[PDB]
Design an enzyme around this catalytic site. Structure first.
Site, PDB file in Angstrom:
ATOM      1  N   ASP A   1     -10.918 -91.565 -27.921  1.00  0.00           N
ATOM      2  CA  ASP A   1     -10.418 -91.425 -26.553  1.00  0.00           C
ATOM      3  C   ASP A   1     -11.196 -90.373 -25.779  1.00  0.00           C
ATOM      4  O   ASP A   1     -10.614 -89.572 -25.042  1.00  0.00           O
ATOM      5  CB  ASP A   1      -8.922 -91.084 -26.561  1.00  0.00           C
ATOM      6  CG  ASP A   1      -8.262 -91.276 -25.198  1.00  0.00           C
ATOM      7  OD1 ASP A   1      -8.879 -91.873 -24.292  1.00  0.00           O
ATOM      8  OD2 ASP A   1      -7.117 -90.820 -25.032  1.00  0.00           O
TER       9      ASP A   1
ATOM     10  N   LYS B   1       1.162 -84.747 -21.142  1.00  0.00           N
ATOM     11  CA  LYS B   1       1.322 -85.608 -22.308  1.00  0.00           C
ATOM     12  C   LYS B   1      -0.017 -86.214 -22.704  1.00  0.00           C
ATOM     13  O   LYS B   1      -0.747 -86.722 -21.853  1.00  0.00           O
ATOM     14  CB  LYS B   1       2.327 -86.723 -22.003  1.00  0.00           C
ATOM     15  CG  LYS B   1       3.644 -86.210 -21.454  1.00  0.00           C
ATOM     16  CD  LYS B   1       4.729 -87.262 -21.497  1.00  0.00           C
ATOM     17  CE  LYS B   1       6.054 -86.688 -21.020  1.00  0.00           C
ATOM     18  NZ  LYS B   1       7.148 -87.698 -21.049  1.00  0.00           N
TER      19      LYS B   1
ATOM     20  N   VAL C   1       2.486 -81.560 -24.391  1.00  0.00           N
ATOM     21  CA  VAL C   1       1.863 -80.247 -24.524  1.00  0.00           C
ATOM     22  C   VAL C   1       2.493 -79.292 -23.520  1.00  0.00           C
ATOM     23  O   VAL C   1       2.682 -79.643 -22.355  1.00  0.00           O
ATOM     24  CB  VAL C   1       0.341 -80.288 -24.296  1.00  0.00           C
ATOM     25  CG1 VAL C   1      -0.251 -78.897 -24.462  1.00  0.00           C
ATOM     26  CG2 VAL C   1      -0.309 -81.243 -25.267  1.00  0.00           C
TER      27      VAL C   1
HETATM   28  N1  LIG Z   1      -4.042 -80.785 -26.228  1.00  0.00           N
HETATM   29  C1  LIG Z   1      -4.295 -79.833 -25.618  1.00  0.00           C
HETATM   30  C2  LIG Z   1      -4.607 -78.658 -24.874  1.00  0.00           C
HETATM   31  C3  LIG Z   1      -5.043 -77.529 -25.555  1.00  0.00           C
HETATM   32  C4  LIG Z   1      -5.348 -76.371 -24.857  1.00  0.00           C
HETATM   33  C5  LIG Z   1      -5.210 -76.393 -23.487  1.00  0.00           C
HETATM   34  N2  LIG Z   1      -5.458 -75.397 -22.628  1.00  0.00           N
HETATM   35  C6  LIG Z   1      -5.181 -75.883 -21.404  1.00  0.00           C
HETATM   36  C7  LIG Z   1      -4.757 -77.189 -21.543  1.00  0.00           C
HETATM   37  C8  LIG Z   1      -4.384 -78.044 -20.400  1.00  0.00           C
HETATM   38  N3  LIG Z   1      -4.219 -77.504 -19.126  1.00  0.00           N
HETATM   39  C9  LIG Z   1      -3.880 -78.305 -18.045  1.00  0.00           C
HETATM   40  C10 LIG Z   1      -3.717 -79.665 -18.255  1.00  0.00           C
HETATM   41  C11 LIG Z   1      -3.893 -80.192 -19.508  1.00  0.00           C
HETATM   42  N4  LIG Z   1      -4.228 -79.409 -20.590  1.00  0.00           N
HETATM   43  N5  LIG Z   1      -3.685 -81.582 -19.480  1.00  0.00           N
HETATM   44  C12 LIG Z   1      -3.731 -82.630 -20.520  1.00  0.00           C
HETATM   45  C13 LIG Z   1      -5.122 -82.655 -21.149  1.00  0.00           C
HETATM   46  C14 LIG Z   1      -5.112 -83.668 -22.299  1.00  0.00           C
HETATM   47  O1  LIG Z   1      -4.164 -83.261 -23.285  1.00  0.00           O
HETATM   48  C15 LIG Z   1      -2.825 -83.293 -22.783  1.00  0.00           C
HETATM   49  C16 LIG Z   1      -2.667 -82.330 -21.593  1.00  0.00           C
HETATM   50  C17 LIG Z   1      -3.382 -81.824 -18.145  1.00  0.00           C
HETATM   51  O2  LIG Z   1      -3.131 -82.934 -17.727  1.00  0.00           O
HETATM   52  N6  LIG Z   1      -3.392 -80.691 -17.339  1.00  0.00           N
HETATM   53  C18 LIG Z   1      -3.093 -80.641 -15.891  1.00  0.00           C
HETATM   54  C19 LIG Z   1      -4.005 -79.735 -15.048  1.00  0.00           C
HETATM   55  O3  LIG Z   1      -5.375 -79.881 -15.406  1.00  0.00           O
HETATM   56  N7  LIG Z   1      -4.793 -77.490 -22.844  1.00  0.00           N
HETATM   57  C20 LIG Z   1      -4.481 -78.635 -23.490  1.00  0.00           C
END
Ligand SMILES: N#Cc1ccc2ncc(-c3ncc4c(n3)n(C3CCOCC3)c(=O)n4CCO)n2c1
EC number: 2.7.10.2
Length: 266
Positions: free
Chosen positions: A129, A16, A22
């Site tokens: 942010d 989130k 997401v």
């Molecule tokens: N928006 C977007 C967005 C766009 C492309 C994308 N490709 C991979 C990710 C992604 N892959 C893993 C995530 C992660 N994002 N996020 C947050 C990052 C901040 O935005 C909300 C999700 C996590 O907490 N994890 C957990 C493990 O690292 N991803 C997020």
């Protein structure tokens, strides 16, 4: 640009933002499971439905190697489709692979983020942010800025914008709710700190500022000129850039354009 709902195969939850949820999906029109992985954001009120429509348009218009790529939308409900960066969040990445990431590689990330931020500034866009949790890893040699849910576009006649986690906020943002490219610079100083502590929890921005009303506490502490400490095994020169990023007055902070060459030439 228009992704059909029935072809987006849900895989798992990526997390989130400041805003919504997401999800990792595979857009798989052919049905072979050969389709490309994508990150899909959506909501689940009118106020954030409005900010979401803006965020979609902002990400759509931004074009940079260091900002997550917009790919399209999926429709009676609006979803935002973005490229999937499989190495995930930088925060987690740094903690996991700390042993194989020297200072040179951290500087590379700093520089890439700085260039991403320099671009945003030229699009008159304030991220609001900037933090390691909102940076994504394209590869071990490449990172990208993400999450533009809190992003604001400066009015075409103003270098700041007043607005309706506190440890990344610049003083004027805490005190007067004022945000700008210069408040983004302050926050960049905090991600430099995060990079060179490898996003270690025990010495995170919160753990340090807590150790040093909570909002009024932090603000009084900043006004006194107290700052996060030099991370261990952070080159002195990098620590000096953080300190410049945390100048009391917005106008005394260096621009992202001035920081870039200073980061690259260490
Ligand atoms: N928006 C977007 C967005 C766009 C492309 C994308 N490709 C991979 C990710 C992604 N892959 C893993 C995530 C992660 N994002 N996020 C947050 C990052 C901040 O935005 C909300 C999700 C996590 O907490 N994890 C957990 C493990 O690292 N991803 C997020």
């Amino acid at each position: 640009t228009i992704f059909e709902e029935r072809h987006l195969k849900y895989i798992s939850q990526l997390g989130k933002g400041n805003f919504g949820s997401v999800e990792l999906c595979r857009y798989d029109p052919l049905g072979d499971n050969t389709g490309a992985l994508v990150a899909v954001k959506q909501l689940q009120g009118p106020d954030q439905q409005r900010d979401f429509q803006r965020e979609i348009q902002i990400l759509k218009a931004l074009h940079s190697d260091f900002i997550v790529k917009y790919r399209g939308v999926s429709y009676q409900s609006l979803r935002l489709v973005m490229e999937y960066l499989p190495s995930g969040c930088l925060r987690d990445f740094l903690q996991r692979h700390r042993a194989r990431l020297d200072a040179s590689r951290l500087l590379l990330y700093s520089s890439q983020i700085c260039k991403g931020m320099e671009y945003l500034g030229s699009r008159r866009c304030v991220h609001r942010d900037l933090a390691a949790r909102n940076i994504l890893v394209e590869s071990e040699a490449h990172v990208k800025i993400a999450d533009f849910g809190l992003a604001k576009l400066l009015p075409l006649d103003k270098d700041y914008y007043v607005v309706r986690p506190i440890f990344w906020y610049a003083p004027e943002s805490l005190s007067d709710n004022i945000f700008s490219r210069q408040s983004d610079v302050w926050s960049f100083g905090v991600v430099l700190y995060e990079l060179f502590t490898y996003c270690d929890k025990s010495c995170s921005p919160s753990a340090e500022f807590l150790r040093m009303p909570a909002l009024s506490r932090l603000l009084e502490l900043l006004e006194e000129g107290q700052r996060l400490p030099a991370p261990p095994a952070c080159p002195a020169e990098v620590h000096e850039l953080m300190k410049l990023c945390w100048a009391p007055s917005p106008q005394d902070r260096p621009s992202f354009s001035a920081l870039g060459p200073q980061l690259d030439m260490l």
